[PDB]
Amino acid sequence: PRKARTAFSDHQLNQLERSFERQKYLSVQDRMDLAAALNLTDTQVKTWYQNRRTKWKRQT
DNA sequence: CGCTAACCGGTT
DNA sequence: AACCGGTTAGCG
């Protein structure tokens, strides 16, 4: 038992990245706000950020 | 295979 | 609870 892999839209990717470039971490409220803006689950966004930070430490 | 979303166990 | 680091796994 495992969740389907989410397919982010160009719009979702773009806004997630934009948010990352602005803030490296999100407060719970900032997360919920972003999830609501992009029609995503809180956890999808939480996970995105986390994986994005991982990528960020690799590439620096 | 490369990129990356999702999961697990441990850190704090 | 959130993050981290390592791991598994979907898909172009």
Author numbering: 232 to 291
Paper text:
Transcription factors (TFs) recognize specific bases within their DNA-binding motifs, with each base contributing nearly independently to total binding energy. However, the energetic contributions of particular dinucleotides can deviate strongly from the additive approximation, indicating that some TFs can specifically recognize DNA dinucleotides. Here we solved high-resolution (<1 Å) structures of MYF5 and BARHL2 bound to DNAs containing sets of dinucleotides that have different affinities to the proteins. The dinucleotides were recognized either enthalpically, by an extensive water network that connects the adjacent bases to the TF, or entropically, by a hydrophobic patch that maintained interfacial water mobility.
Mutation of the AC sequence led to a much larger loss of affinity than mutation of TT. Mutating the A7 to either G or C of DNAAC resulted in a loss of most water-mediated contacts and a very low affinity. Both DNAGC and DNACC complexes showed only one water molecule in the interface connecting the side-chain oxygens of Thr285 and Asn282 with the N4 of C18 or O6 of G18, respectively. Furthermore, neither complex retained the hydrophobic contacts involving either Thr278 or Thr285, further explaining their very low affinity.
